[PDB]
Ligand binder design. Structure first.
Ligand SMILES: Nc1ncnc2c1ncn2[C@@H]1O[C@H](COP(=O)(O)OP(=O)(O)OP(=O)(O)O)[C@@H](O)[C@H]1O
Ligand SMILES: [Mg+2]
Lengths: 49, 237, 60, 203, 46, 100, 118, 118
């Protein structure tokens, strides 16, 4: 019982840590994606001009 | 002399030696077959002239395999010499593997090896699909074929393969753009570049959703209902 | 008697609770993954909107 | 190449024709074998029915197997399908009758609990994602009493385990059972008529 | 034999026909440059 | 060509003749036009060792079809480094024979 | 997708894919019928038969032949209906419910007249 | 037999017989599936598939088309290997182990790479 409780607490804490890490990584990926796509749109606008 | 008409035309498309400037002319003759009869006179004439053929099917096109290349019959007679080192390394035997996969799929229409072959072939067929007016730079093609042949699509469901590919490419374009730069500049995939790409793929797999969201990481009528009974020789109680 | 009953309940509850902790880990992983995918999807949709807008303006 | 393709197709169709005619004759003999087996099984069934009749007529009818349950909400259903596929609509008809029985049980507010015999029903229900509690395969061609005994033992154990169940709780039994046993199978009416039928085996 | 070639749960006569036909087919075979005198052919067919 | 199915399985080199063969409406013109459009970056480099100059010969094609091809090339910027030799369906057999 | 929109194109391509698979399976079906196919292929074949029946229509110029007035189906309704078909939302309706009708209202009326409810 | 010897001739003839029988059974397998063949026919089909794969070879001049260097198989080894194949001594290996290899050593190495043992 003690081992199961400790393992569960550790698993939950690690889950929260990994969720935070993956969420912030996804936010960074979204930022970079937006920047790259804005650059691509700017190139398209220059082509239209 | 109808064969001569096309033979002397297509033989002018050549690759000149350095002594003549090193210029080249690549030919993409188009031939229309009727009822998928490549045995007609003109198609057979031309097929025997050119340095390979890309043979397109209405059947494959309608199945969603677009471009509708018949892998088994389509060939290039230049081969690896017409590819950069990285493409050769990743696409070394892709065409042969797809031909074997089509053969097996027709046969198996089953041991573990056959299951694995069918799964990989389905994933590769999905990988080679491509919309119109959506060109892929050679480095991006190298990375996509690397996803395919190196087995990184095995965990991904077939229906998601395409999407996966696109997303992953976008990722590599948004971050880790030095992989594409290395492939484009050096014309080859370095061992450390390969390791970085594998690590990037494995990391990206954590944040990817399948169609079902799964992880890619690693009235009868009672009267008709006959009733069993026990026969008993007693008066109705 | 209470000790024996509590021990049987302890074994059962510990097994099911280990399983529940593992399932909760997987649930948190799936929720975080879905959040990340939603962020990326909406970001790329916004980018597509921006490119369409600016292309239309350039054409005009 | 049109003529060459047509000639190849003619050869292929000839081979298929020969194989199908052979299989038809083999099935014709197998029908006689199966009917002989049914005849051989007839006397034991008749006499054991007589014995059960006598025992019931000289005893009280209180067996849990013989008495229904109140507000039943679980019925076991055993679907008997084939293994090979070259049967025309045998498996399809069996599974359609099973679906009719499932709808009927839903009308009675009872969730069917599925058991399967044969690979074809397994494939059908796997495609539909309906769970199969247990499955026996590889004998639909020539079933022996061993397989029937095992199947009946499993179904009866489940039904008995369903006596103490409360709501969805297994109860004192410790395992959740069922309140009914139905069998969906094809009844050999005659050489020309073969009808799928649902038959409540218990209680 | 060519009628039964598509087929073992047959009549005794059918099984005998199948086996006899297999033996006869194997008997009619012959290597190159190996003509047989008529009497030898008679005995083999016998 | 920018097409994985081709660049990976039936690669085309400079100086090679690759036949695009198939029934009507199987995507042949699409493949060829995509290949022409893919040379846009090579052209933008400005290096003649990398630049590819494209010639699109249209034989017996409907005039509006050739106009559609030209429009597609225009939109992708290919028309800067492309020449079209057009022998539409209305032309005499002499032009259709002579255009390639 | 550039001209007719993304959904029109997707629905058309799915219909074409289903019909192409049915055409491929005709070789098996002509000999062994539908029952030797896999569950996926059986479902696809039923869907394809319903789709090919629903592509038929009571034409205006066909009244002189059958006496039945023709029907006009708006494009948006056509796309919606074939999207529903390709997704198997009408698989329970009988095949003849889809034969020589217009839109989804006609489908409901004919299915009801046959005995199935949409 | 006079020119190549009895063993070579017999092995070649047996290979040809197996391939001919497989060619005859191919359409049956395509339509009715392989499970409806006899045990002897199924064994022959497995042997024939392995034989046809093993007749393929990584050719010296084909490297530019596969990147794989070519191989040369001595005649004695070829006869021995195909005798073994016709006898069914490699039926435990996946057929993919026999594709574009040289002699028996290459077969063993490729089978190991695929998890099988020779
Ligand atoms: N990769 C692709 N993905 C989707 N649609 C495609 C693709 N390639 C071509 N198409 C479409 O297929 C149709 C036929 O294309 P295309 O005109 O290139 O074919 P073709 O064989 O040259 O035809 P034709 O017989 O008219 O000359 C067009 O609608 C084209 O948009
Ligand atoms: Mg065209």
């Amino acid at each position: 019982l003690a081992d199961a409780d400790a393992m569960h607490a550790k698993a939950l804490a690690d889950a929260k840590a990994e969720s935070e890490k993956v969420t912030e990584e996804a936010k960074q990926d979204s930022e970079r994606i937006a920047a790259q796509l804005s650059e691509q749109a700017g190139s398209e606008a220059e082509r239209i001009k | 002399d109808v064969f001569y008409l096309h033979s002397r035309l297509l033989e002018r498309c050549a690759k000149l030696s350095d002594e003549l400037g090193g210029g080249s002319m690549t030919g993409l003759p188009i031939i229309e077959t009727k009822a998928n009869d490549i045995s007609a006179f003109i198609p057979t004439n031309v097929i025997s002239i050119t340095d390979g053929q890309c043979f397109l099917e209405s059947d494959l096109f309608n199945q969603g395999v677009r471009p509708a290349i018949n892998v088994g019959v389509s060939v290039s007679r230049v081969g690896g010499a017409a590819q950069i080192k990285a493409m050769k390394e990743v696409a070394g035997s892709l065409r042969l593997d797809l031909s074997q996969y089509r053969e097996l799929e027709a046969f198996a229409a089953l041991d573990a090896a056959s299951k694995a072959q069918l799964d990989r072939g389905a994933r590769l067929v999905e990988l080679l699909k491509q919309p119109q007016y959506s060109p892929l730079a050679v480095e991006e093609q190298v990375v996509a074929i690397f996803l395919g042949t190196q087995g990184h699509l095995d965990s991904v469901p077939v229906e998601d393969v395409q999407r996966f590919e696109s997303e992953l490419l976008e990722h590599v374009k948004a971050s880790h753009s030095d992989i594409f730069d290395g492939i484009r500049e050096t014309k080859k995939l370095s061992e450390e570049a390969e390791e970085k790409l594998v690590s990037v793929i494995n990391e990206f797999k954590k944040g990817f959703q399948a169609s079902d969201g799964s992880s890619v990481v690693v009235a009868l009528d009672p009267e008709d209902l006959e009733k069993e009974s026990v026969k008993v020789r007693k008066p109705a109680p | 008697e209470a000790m024996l009953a509590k021990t049987a309940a302890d074994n059962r509850k510990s097994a099911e609770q280990v399983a529940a902790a593992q399932a909760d880990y997987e649930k948190e992983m799936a929720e975080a993954r879905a959040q990340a995918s939603a962020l990326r999807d909406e970001a790329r949709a916004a980018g597509r909107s921006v490119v369409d807008e600016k292309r239309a303006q350039a054409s005009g | 190449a049109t003529l060459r393709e047509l000639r190849g197709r003619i050869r292929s169709a000839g081979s298929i024709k020969k194989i199908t005619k052979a299989q038809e004759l083999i099935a014709t003999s197998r029908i006689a074998k199966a009917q002989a087996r049914v005849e051989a099984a007839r006397p034991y069934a008749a006499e054991i029915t007589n014995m059960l009749t006598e025992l019931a007529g000289a005893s009280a009818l209180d067996h849990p197997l013989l008495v229904e349950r109140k507000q039943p909400k679980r019925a076991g259903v055993l679907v008997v399908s084939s293994d090979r596929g070259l049967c025309g609509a045998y498996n399809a008809n069996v599974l359609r009758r099973a679906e009719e029985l499932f709808s009927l049980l839903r009308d009675e507010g009872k969730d069917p609990v599925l058991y399967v015999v044969g690979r074809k029903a397994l494939g059908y229900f796997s495609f539909r994602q309906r769970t199969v509690v247990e499955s026996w395969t590889g004998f639909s061609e020539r079933p022996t009493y061993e397989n029937a005994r095992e199947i009946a033992d499993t179904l009866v154990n489940a039904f008995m385990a369903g006596a103490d169940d409360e709501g969805d709780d297994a109860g004192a039994d410790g395992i959740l059972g069922v309140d009914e046993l139905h069998i969906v199978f094809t009844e050999f009416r005659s050489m020309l008529s073969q009808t799928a039928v649902a038959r409540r085996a218990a209680p | 034999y060519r009628e039964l070639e598509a087929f073992s749960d047959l009549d005794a006569a059918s099984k005998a026909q199948l086996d006899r036909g297999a033996r006869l087919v194997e008997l009619l075979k012959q290597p190159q440059y190996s003509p047989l005198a008529v009497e030898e052919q008679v005995v083999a067919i016998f | 060509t920018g097409i994985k199915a081709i660049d990976a399985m039936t690669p085309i080199g400079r100086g090679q003749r690759q036949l695009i063969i198939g029934d009507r409406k199987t995507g042949k013109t699409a493949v060829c036009v995509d290949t022409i459009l893919n040379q846009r970056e090579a052209w933008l480099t400005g290096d003649p060792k990398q630049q590819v100059r494209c010639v699109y010969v249209a034989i017996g094609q409907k005039g509006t079809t050739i106009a559609s091809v030209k429009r597609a090339l225009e939109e992708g910027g290919a028309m800067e480094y492309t020449t079209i030799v057009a022998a539409p369906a209305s032309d005499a057999a002499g032009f259709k024979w002579l255009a390639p | 997708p550039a001209i007719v929109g993304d959904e029109h194109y997707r629905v058309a391509q799915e219909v074409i894919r289903i019909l192409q698979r049915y055409k491929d399976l005709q070789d098996i079906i002509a000999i062994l019928g539908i029952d030797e196919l896999s569950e996926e292929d059986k479902q696809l074949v039923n869907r394809a038969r319903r789709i090919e029946r629903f592509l038929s229509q009571n034409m205006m110029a066909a009244e002189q032949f059958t006496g039945q007035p023709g029907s006009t189906v708006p494009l948006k309704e056509t796309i919606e209906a074939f999207d529903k078909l390709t997704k198997g939302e009408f698989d329970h309706l009988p095949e003849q419910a889809f034969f020589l009708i217009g839109g989804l209202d006609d489908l409901a009326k004919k299915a009801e007249s046959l005995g199935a409810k949409l």
